[PDB]
Amino acid sequence: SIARSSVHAKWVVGKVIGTAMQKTAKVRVTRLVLDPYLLKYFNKRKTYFAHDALQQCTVGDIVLLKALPVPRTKHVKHELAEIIFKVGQVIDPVTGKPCAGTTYLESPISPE
Amino acid sequence: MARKKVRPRLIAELARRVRALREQRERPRDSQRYALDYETMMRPHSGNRLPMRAWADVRHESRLLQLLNRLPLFGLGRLVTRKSWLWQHDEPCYWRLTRVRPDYAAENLDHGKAWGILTFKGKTESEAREIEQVMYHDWRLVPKHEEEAFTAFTLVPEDTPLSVPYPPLLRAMILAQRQKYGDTSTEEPMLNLERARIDPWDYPAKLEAKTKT
Amino acid sequence: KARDHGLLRYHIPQVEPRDLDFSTTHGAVSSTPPAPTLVSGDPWYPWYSWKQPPERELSRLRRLYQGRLREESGPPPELMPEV
Amino acid sequence: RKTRHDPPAKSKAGRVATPPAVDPTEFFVLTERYRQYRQTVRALRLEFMSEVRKKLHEARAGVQAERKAQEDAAEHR
Amino acid sequence: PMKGRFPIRRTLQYLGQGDVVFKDSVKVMTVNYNTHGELGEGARKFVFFNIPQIQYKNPWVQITMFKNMTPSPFLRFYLDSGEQVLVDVESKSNKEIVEHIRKILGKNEETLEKEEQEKKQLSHPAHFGPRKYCLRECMCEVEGQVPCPGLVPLPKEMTGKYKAALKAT
Amino acid sequence: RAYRGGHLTIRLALGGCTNRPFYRIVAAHSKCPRDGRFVEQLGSYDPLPNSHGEKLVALNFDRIRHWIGCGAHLSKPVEKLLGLSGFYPLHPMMITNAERLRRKRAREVLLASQKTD
Amino acid sequence: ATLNQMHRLGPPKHPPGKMGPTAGRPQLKGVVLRTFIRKPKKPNSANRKCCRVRLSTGREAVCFIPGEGHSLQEHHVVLVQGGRTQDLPGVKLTVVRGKYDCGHVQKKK
RNA sequence: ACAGGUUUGGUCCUGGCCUUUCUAUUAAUUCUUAAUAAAAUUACACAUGCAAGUAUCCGCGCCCCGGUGAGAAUGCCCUCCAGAUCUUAAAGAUCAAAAGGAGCAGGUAUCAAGCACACCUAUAACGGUAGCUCAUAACGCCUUGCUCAACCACACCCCCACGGGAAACAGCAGUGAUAAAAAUUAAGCCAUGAACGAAAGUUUGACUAAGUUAUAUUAAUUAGAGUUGGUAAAUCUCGUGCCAGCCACCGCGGUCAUACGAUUAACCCAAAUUAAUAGAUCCACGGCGUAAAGAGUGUUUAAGAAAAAAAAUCACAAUA
Ligand code: FES
Ligand SMILES: [K+]
Numbered sequence A: 001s002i003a004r005s006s007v008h009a010k011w012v013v014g015k016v017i018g019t020a021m022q023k024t025a026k027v028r029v030t031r032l033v034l035d036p037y038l039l040k041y042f043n044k045r046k047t048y049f050a051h052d053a054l055q056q057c058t059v060g061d062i063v064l065l066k067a068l069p070v071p072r073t074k075h076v077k078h079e080l081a082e083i084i085f086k087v088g089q090v091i092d093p094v095t096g097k098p099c100a101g102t103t104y105l106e107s108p109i110s111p112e
Numbered sequence B: 001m002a003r004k005k006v007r008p009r010l011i012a013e014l015a016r017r018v019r020a021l022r023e024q025r026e027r028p029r030d031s032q033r034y035a036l037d038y039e040t041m042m043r044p045h046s047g048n049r050l051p052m053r054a055w056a057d058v059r060h061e062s063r064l065l066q067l068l069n070r071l072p073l074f075g076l077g078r079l080v081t082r083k084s085w086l087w088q089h090d091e092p093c094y095w096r097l098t099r100v101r102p103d104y105a106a107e108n109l110d111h112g113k114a115w116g117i118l119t120f121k122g123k124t125e126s127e128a129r130e131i132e133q134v135m136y137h138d139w140r141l142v143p144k145h146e147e148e149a150f151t152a153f154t155l156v157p158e159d160t161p162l163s164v165p166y167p168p169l170l171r172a173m174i175l176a177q178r179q180k181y182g183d184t185s186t187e188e189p190m191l192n193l194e195r196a197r198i199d200p201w202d203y204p205a206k207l208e209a210k211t212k213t
Numbered sequence C: 001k002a003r004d005h006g007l008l009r010y011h012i013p014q015v016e017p018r019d020l021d022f023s024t025t026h027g028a029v030s031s032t033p034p035a036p037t038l039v040s041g042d043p044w045y046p047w048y049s050w051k052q053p054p055e056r057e058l059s060r061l062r063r064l065y066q067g068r069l070r071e072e073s074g075p076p077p078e079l080m081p082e083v
Numbered sequence D: 001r002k003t004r005h006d007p008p009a010k011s012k013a014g015r016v017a018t019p020p021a022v023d024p025t026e027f028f029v030l031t032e033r034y035r036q037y038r039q040t041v042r043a044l045r046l047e048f049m050s051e052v053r054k055k056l057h058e059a060r061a062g063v064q065a066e067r068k069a070q071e072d073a074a075e076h077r
Numbered sequence E: 001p002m003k004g005r006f007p008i009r010r011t012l013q014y015l016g017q018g019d020v021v022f023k024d025s026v027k028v029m030t031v032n033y034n035t036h037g038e039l040g041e042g043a044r045k046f047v048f049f050n051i052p053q054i055q056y057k058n059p060w061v062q063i064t065m066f067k068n069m070t071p072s073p074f075l076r077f078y079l080d081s082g083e084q085v086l087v088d089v090e091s092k093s094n095k096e097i098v099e100h101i102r103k104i105l106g107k108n109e110e111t112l113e114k115e116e117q118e119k120k121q122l123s124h125p126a127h128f129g130p131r132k133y134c135l136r137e138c139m140c141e142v143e144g145q146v147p148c149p150g151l152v153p154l155p156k157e158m159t160g161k162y163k164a165a166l167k168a169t
Numbered sequence F: 001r002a003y004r005g006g007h008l009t010i011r012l013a014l015g016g017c018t019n020r021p022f023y024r025i026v027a028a029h030s031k032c033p034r035d036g037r038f039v040e041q042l043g044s045y046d047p048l049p050n051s052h053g054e055k056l057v058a059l060n061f062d063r064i065r066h067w068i069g070c071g072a073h074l075s076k077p078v079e080k081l082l083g084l085s086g087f088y089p090l091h092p093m094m095i096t097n098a099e100r101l102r103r104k105r106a107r108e109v110l111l112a113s114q115k116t117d
Numbered sequence G: 001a002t003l004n005q006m007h008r009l010g011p012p013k014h015p016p017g018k019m020g021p022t023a024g025r026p027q028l029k030g031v032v033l034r035t036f037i038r039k040p041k042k043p044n045s046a047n048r049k050c051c052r053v054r055l056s057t058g059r060e061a062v063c064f065i066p067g068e069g070h071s072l073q074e075h076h077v078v079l080v081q082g083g084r085t086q087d088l089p090g091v092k093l094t095v096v097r098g099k100y101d102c103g104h105v106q107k108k109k
Numbered sequence H: 001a002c003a004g005g006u007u008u009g010g011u012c013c014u015g016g017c018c019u020u021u022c023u024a025u026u027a028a029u030u031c032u033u034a035a036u037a038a039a040a041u042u043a044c045a046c047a048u049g050c051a052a053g054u055a056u057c058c059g060c061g062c063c064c065c066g067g068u069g070a071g072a073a074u075g076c077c078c079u080c081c082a083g084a085u086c087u088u089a090a091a092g093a094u095c096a097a098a099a100g101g102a103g104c105a106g107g108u109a110u111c112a113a114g115c116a117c118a119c120c121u122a123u124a125a126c127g128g129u130a131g132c133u134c135a136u137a138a139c140g141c142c143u144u145g146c147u148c149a150a151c152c153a154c155a156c157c158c159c160c161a162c163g164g165g166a167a168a169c170a171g172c173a174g175u176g177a178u179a180a181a182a183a184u185u186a187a188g189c190c191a192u193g194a195a196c197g198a199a200a201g202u203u204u205g206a207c208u209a210a211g212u213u214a215u216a217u218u219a220a221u222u223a224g225a226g227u228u229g230g231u232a233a234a235u236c237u238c239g240u241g242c243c244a245g246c247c248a249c250c251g252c253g254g255u256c257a258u259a260c261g262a263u264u265a266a267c268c269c270a271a272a273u274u275a276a277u278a279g280a281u282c283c284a285c286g287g288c289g290u291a292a293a294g295a296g297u298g299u300u301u302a303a304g305a306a307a308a309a310a311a312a313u314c315a316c317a318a319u320a
């Protein structure tokens, strides 16, 4: 059962930047870093490459990434796991209903 | 560790290949490597001077190959003894030669590597091991009529104790632990001196290494 | 020095006892049973004492180390006197 | 300290070694002590080796390890 | 601190007084909240107050914000084994969320106290060396032992200069 | 530091100022310097007697046997130091030096008496 | 300067000091090239005894001789400090008396 | 910082420089003794002696210790870790290459674009897609050993070292040159550490114990230096007359100087004192009408705020 990885990040969540290359999406991960002087947290942006076998990435999505056990090249070290939020097509994880921002597209209290 | 300004050095790899190629092509032969001057006791090749404890044996004995060349098949199946074991051990110690390949560089054919079967203190091993310390000027050859005289051995059982008392401070902790945990037996602890058998220092070591088992 | 003699007052914090359980039962503080070699007076190991080697072994060593041999000595004294 | 490639000295280039004298009675007794001393230490060394194996095995798949593993798994569910 | 709405929350004590330690299996925490409506008061105050405290004790846990994407605020946790924990907050206050999080994925009090107890033995008091790692630096700092020759000069009988003079004489 | 080889060894590390030696029982790689980086410090050894006439020695017995169990070599003085404590049997060289002292002392006593008479 | 701007620019760090006339070295050795007299600026008027020497670094600079009376001539070896004279613009070195070819001030006799 | 001196005829405000504190090197003046710590110009050229041997021949060891800070923004922390070695019941441990990244990491944007720096299929070819890094600083340039139980790097030079230039002390001591920088061409393996031997043991300029030097601290046997207008503790009598000279900042001297030089007296440190250069420290969680500061204007991208409430305007000289 040896399927570990040498990278420090096993699971990360980032926003898709572009899908120009073939079967690979460039995503932007955001993390909070404490400024030593002001003692305040600011976002730090880093770019990651994720392999999408099904070509399901659209610019503006939020995608969970899983650490790749073996790197495929010097840059692609992560593999796409799921599409957390499709752009424009967002379903509430609680009620399982389509929504557009704040207004529900479909009323959850109307089964029929 | 790595950086973005890594320069692809190539001369270091180039030197490694040539240096490795040179030693393989220019590998010193056993005759010229072990050729020795018998007056200055200095090795012309390595520039080393032998210790004074070995000066007497060089001039008053011959090495293995000097006493092995004048044999039909270079003494296959013969028994070869060594002066080192004879002086210190009353029990017979000898080697049963399996194969031997001398080097053709020597004009007198007095060098080479040989294998054999080990018989130390009457104990015989079931595997062939390469003969160590061949170049030493202490080897001797047994006659045909004396082959059975040395072969016959009288097995003497060992009288060494199989258990010894523990060291005093370490013995106390053994008693303390079992008393603390509830084991109140007053039997004196003993150390099993059975797995710690030590071969004598003169026993030759395996020249070949050991692979993963 | 004055504080060490009690002539001057200074703060003395309250200190808890050093140990949690006060038990003298353990063998570290209680006397352990004597070793069988201790009561007899024999040395803890047989090779601690001096034993006269066989004469055959002495002859073998003299032959091996001939020329650079040194004068031998007997058993060491049991007790060393004082000058 | 010198390196591999530097040449050796000139004055100390003829001598090799000068072993000291050997006391026949003393050397044999000392040799006997070493043979028993090495054997005793080797048994202690192997005894300590087995202790390390016992300690390491208990830390990996000890009974308490399974209890801890099941407790966190049960709590998580 | 002078600037900011609540300058107290940007001091070391405030960052250090938050006691929420995630387990080793927690890697990603996703928080979604709305900037409008009275229902999101608990979520917004949780982001404004408690999130810096949570991140300070979990430097290796990624925290990402998303505003106005889901009408119902919620928190999503991603584990190492791919397990997903969904926490729903729609009326819970600032304090309720912290207590709820501390129980589902926070570490037990007994685990935290035993963790630091095992850390204390690393700095064993019986060792010697530099002040940053050991208490004493030399044996002369122990009452009763022979003091350092720098402070109190040693007697002449023990000085090596006197020992060598008599040997050569 | 990256060394070619070497074996783990428990030895004594010198310390203190001039005329005041102080050895630390430490376990470090054989190829590292005497006062260089080490794995774990075991104990201490005060070579000079105190006001009570005692030479204090500290031993980390459970950790000492742990390193010996994993194949750590021991130098000459640590074996003598462990031999005195009783964790190990008395070193053969410790006994021989004792025997030499008795014979030298016996010769000294006899030599003085011969001159006296 | 709001919080975001302060974060972007980072904390202010004091710049390293600029090297003085002696290039960061406490004292320098020079060879006398010419001896002349320099006059101060008002309201201080006098005839200051200065000299022009070339330092060990190869540069040529103007130096000043403190004290009353001197016997310095061309191609003499002297030692210069890093002090400055307030009355004379440009002069930023002083010869330390009592070293090499320049001795201490001679008491009236 | 508990602050002080200094703008102006004068007050307040804003704003620089400097004083007062501590550490190191060199120099000046001075100097009695002992102990401990430390020993530092130069990656420039080096005379001579020494720094690796051990051992019944094989073998093992031979910048490992030590030395240096040239080079490189090198790195710190951290994940993984082949391989070498030691131990043995072949699975435990020590050191850890290469490779990789949550974060952290000198100055400079008057260095703003680098110019192939990406990826897919199967192959480990071919073919196909046209991308990758970067104003959160890419790509450049300049300076530099370090975040210290220690770490990184170099071993005459040509990043390397087949080769070539060329003929090597950045091992201890010592010499030439050079620099403001000035330790003995010494003793011993007694201790400890390392190499080798089964072992007595051998080697070891690492080290141990000494030699040398006010470089620091202490004790005592030892007394000189600086300063005396103000900030800042302390003086008189003469000489000199904007002259000779003094000052860290403000300033003094132009025949009645507590500031120059000498004398008397005093003050303050003390085997040290003073000066010179570096370093610790020190700017803005402060400001933008009049002071250095809201850029000639509007929209938008990156980015960020929303949280309680509430908000599409309008007689008139917009513009084309
Ligand atoms: S510091 Fe302990 S002897 Fe000096
Ligand atoms: K001011």
Ligand SMILES: [K+]
Binding pocket: H189
């Ligand atoms: K020694």
Ligand SMILES: [Mg+2]
Binding pocket: B048
């Ligand atoms: Mg040799």
Ligand SMILES: [Mg+2]
Binding pocket: F016, F017, F018
């Ligand atoms: Mg020392």
Ligand SMILES: [Mg+2]
Binding pocket: G083, G084
């Ligand atoms: Mg001045």
Ligand SMILES: [Mg+2]
Binding pocket: G086
């Ligand atoms: Mg002025």
Ligand SMILES: [Mg+2]
Binding pocket: G098, G099, G100
């Ligand atoms: Mg002079």
Ligand SMILES: [Mg+2]
Binding pocket: H007, H008
């Ligand atoms: Mg003004």
Ligand SMILES: [Mg+2]
Binding pocket: none
């Ligand atoms: Mg004025």
Ligand SMILES: [Mg+2]
Binding pocket: none
């Ligand atoms: Mg000097």
Ligand SMILES: [Mg+2]
Binding pocket: none
């Ligand atoms: Mg001295």
Ligand SMILES: [Mg+2]
Binding pocket: none
């Ligand atoms: Mg041998």
Ligand SMILES: [Mg+2]
Binding pocket: none
């Ligand atoms: Mg070093």
Ligand SMILES: [Mg+2]
Binding pocket: none
């Ligand atoms: Mg330098």
Ligand SMILES: [Mg+2]
Binding pocket: none
């Ligand atoms: Mg440099």
Ligand SMILES: [Mg+2]
Binding pocket: none
């Ligand atoms: Mg560079």
Ligand SMILES: [Mg+2]
Binding pocket: B001
């Ligand atoms: Mg590594």
